[PDB]
Amino acid sequence: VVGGTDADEGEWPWQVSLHALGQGHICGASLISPNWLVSAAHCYIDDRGFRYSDPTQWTAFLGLHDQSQRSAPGVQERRLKRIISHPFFNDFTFDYDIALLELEKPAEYSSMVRPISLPDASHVFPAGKAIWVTGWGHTQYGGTGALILQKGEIRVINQTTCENLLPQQITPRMMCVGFLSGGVDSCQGDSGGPLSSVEDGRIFQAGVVSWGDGCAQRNKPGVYTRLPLFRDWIKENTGV
Amino acid sequence: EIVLTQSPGTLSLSPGERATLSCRASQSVSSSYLAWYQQKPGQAPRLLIYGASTRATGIPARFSGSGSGTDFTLTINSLEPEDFAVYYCQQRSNWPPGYTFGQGTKVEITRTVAAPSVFIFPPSDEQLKSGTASVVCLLNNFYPREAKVQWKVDNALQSGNSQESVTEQDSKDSTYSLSSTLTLSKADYEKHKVYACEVTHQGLSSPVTKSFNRGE
Amino acid sequence: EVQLVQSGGGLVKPGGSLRLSCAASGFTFSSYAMSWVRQAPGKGLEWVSAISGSGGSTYYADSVKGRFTISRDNSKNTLYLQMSSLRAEDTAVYYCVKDLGIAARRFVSGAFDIWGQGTMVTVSSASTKGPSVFPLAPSSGTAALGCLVKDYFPEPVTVSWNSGALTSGVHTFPAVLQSSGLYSLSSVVTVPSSSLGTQTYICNVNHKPSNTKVDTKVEP
Ligand SMILES: OC[C@H]1O[C@@](CO)(O[C@H]2O[C@H](CO)[C@@H](O)[C@H](O)[C@H]2O)[C@@H](O)[C@@H]1O
């Protein structure tokens, strides 16, 4: 997350860190039930001789704040039983960039581990709405990942504006969220993590960190997979 | 889907001049997704500029790219004789997925008028055995490309029985060369004595003729 | 160190099939989308087909859709193009290309930064034919001489002089298509008039489609 600040402990208890064997933190994910995470499909593609598609290769850290304190009180580690990429995920276009991760053993809910609510198909996140991106991604393009969970407030950008900012790259599955002036954005290593929307008091997940043209550049807000589109798919596949 | 229109079609400039080449897109293209290539004759294209303005590895600084939206420009700042090439622009689209290329700007190199050296070659004995005669006229290292080559056989002007081929501009001295080949049967060949190639060119104050008498 | 080495191609009959291969080295093949781009003689560049890094997503130009299949073997770092129901219009030099884009790292691009060497595919009902090579002898400052490479099909032929050891003054002209349906070309070289009879001048011609090599000494 570029331009963010340290999260408070327990502030984003649905935020999950996914480590690939021998590599540490690679992507984020969100807890939606005791047994299921939402993440981005592009993170679980085989690459550079490593089987990122094999669920046995991953460890999920729940209730994590600081990557250098993985054994801290309230942190839970879980193996994955499986990865369900969206059947329409496309790694040429990044369309349908969403996956479901089944935990091998359930998460125990605590003060530092709680689920985020899924928005119904009809739930609208209007343009202009302030929402939050969080993660352990790079704090500058070409930089290095944050040890402490970062948060940044960003705004939903109108789809037409978004399409025009990134011509021929934006599908109806995607949403731009950020600022035209840049400054605050997701970045590498934030992929898969949640956009968290405060509605009321209820928190819903608005999207999933997917990609962008660099990070925090003027006129290049991050792109996110939209979540209401996938409500039924999520229910059919997980029962959540 | 996206049409890239390149202009002008051809450009001829002296070394040391600046070349400005345009690529117009039918719809907006993100700068990230717009690139330029150079293709020299007989070679694979090579990447020059990516993302509208980023010079590729090992590409000299005299090549610059700029522009946005629908208007993109490749600038070659102090053209060298070796920059003779076709330059192509190209975009990628993800939605709908696709790649397209403009149709190119050919950059030719201007230099001073240069006269051809002319040479005439009778068909080889080895060929005539085969029942055909090829007579070859060579015009070497001239400029500009425009040239008139006429074949006369016993002073009879020929028509329809020759073909020409022209080299691409030389990368160092910017000249051309051209071969004209007159093809006749053995029997027709053996019926005439005087084979002559007459070359008209702006570097020559009057046309030059090279000839041979069959036999000698 | 970064390279794409192509193999396959050549002469094929209309309605036939051919597979092109492209061996990748010096980069993480699996991380990049790859394409085939072709160029018909005297025409521009035409993108034919793309495949994502993973191989999960493929696209085709309308001109080849339903007839060509792109594939990749990431364990072998190889890209393929299976061509089928070939037509005359598919005659072209085919290049494999690596795409520079890598959205997984937030670097977006559409550029083909690495190009294979190209493979000529000629779709024809005609059988191959090797050339006859004839000398263009120097006539009795600087003299000119050469080789006429006559009556071959398909393209190309390559010409060298003294095995690559004679480069300057050489002009190998573009092939012309003769009315007979066969190609012809000349390669000439200009050399010092006093060197004739002292120095050896042999032109080496290779027509790979007919497996024809032929050295021809040119004198005097
Ligand atoms: O595939 C057709 C499509 O490709 C473009 C370049 O993007 O043209 C290429 O193919 C044409 C038809 O085969 C060639 O004449 C042209 O020279 C070559 O660039 C598009 O212009 C065309 O729609």
The description of the largest β-sheet of chain C is: 7 strands, mixed
> What is the count of DSSP helices of chain C, taking H or I runs of 4+ residues?
0
Count of all domains of chain A: 2
Alpha-carbon distance between the two ends of chain C: 46 Å
Task: Using the alpha-carbon principal axes, give the shape of chain A.
Answer: globular
PDB class: hydrolase
Keywords: antibody-protein, protein-protein, protease inhibitor, disease mutation, glycoprotein, hydrolase, membrane, serine protease, signal-anchor, transmembrane
Assembly: trimeric
Entry title: Structures of Fab-Protease Complexes Reveal a Highly Specific Non-Canonical Mechanism of Inhibition.
Concise overview:
Chain B is mainly β and 216 residues long. Chain B has helices at residues 125-129, 186-191, and strands spanning 4-7, 10-13, 19-29, 34-39, 46-50, 54-55, 63-76, 85-94, 97-101, 105-109, 117-121, 132-142, 148-153, 156-157, 162-166, 176-185, 194-200, 208-213.
Protein described:
The complex is a heterotrimer of chains A (240), B (216) and C (220). Chain A has 240 residues and is mainly beta. Chain A has helices spanning 159-165, 231-238, and strands at 5-6, 15-20, 24-31, 36-39, 58-62, 76-85, 99-103, 130-135, 150-156, 174-178, 194-198, 203-211, 222-226. In chain A, the strands form 2 sheets. Chain A has a 6-stranded antiparallel β-barrel with strand order 8-9-10-13-12-11. Chain A has a 6-stranded antiparallel beta barrel with strand order 2-3-4-7-6-5. Helices cover 5% and strands 55% of the residues of chain B. Chain B has helices at 125-129, 186-191; strands at residues 4-7, 10-13, 19-29, 34-39, 46-50, 54-55, 63-76, 85-94, 97-101, 105-109, 117-121, 132-142, 148-153, 156-157, 162-166, 176-185, 194-200, 208-213. In chain B, the strands form 4 sheets. In chain B, strands 2, 4, 5, 6, 8, 9 and 10 form a 7-stranded mixed sheet that branches. Chain B has a 4-stranded antiparallel sheet with strand order 11-12-16-15. A 4-stranded antiparallel sheet of chain B has the order 14-13-17-18, with no helix packed on it. In chain B, a hairpin with a 2-residue loop joins β13 (148-153) and β14. The longest helix of chain B has 6 residues, at 186-191. Chain B is elongated, with a radius of gyration of 23 Å. Chain C has 220 residues and is mainly beta. Chain C folds into 2 domains: 1-125, Immunoglobulins (Immunoglobulin-like, Sandwich), CATH 2.60.40.10; 126-220, Immunoglobulins (Immunoglobulin-like), CATH 2.60.40. Helices cover 0% and strands 49% of the residues of chain C. Chain C is elongated and about 70 Å long. The relative contact order of chain C is 0.16. Chains in contact: A-B, A-C, B-C. The complex binds a molecule of 2 linked components (GLC-FRU). Chain A: Belongs to the peptidase S1 family. Chain A: It comes from Homo sapiens (Human).
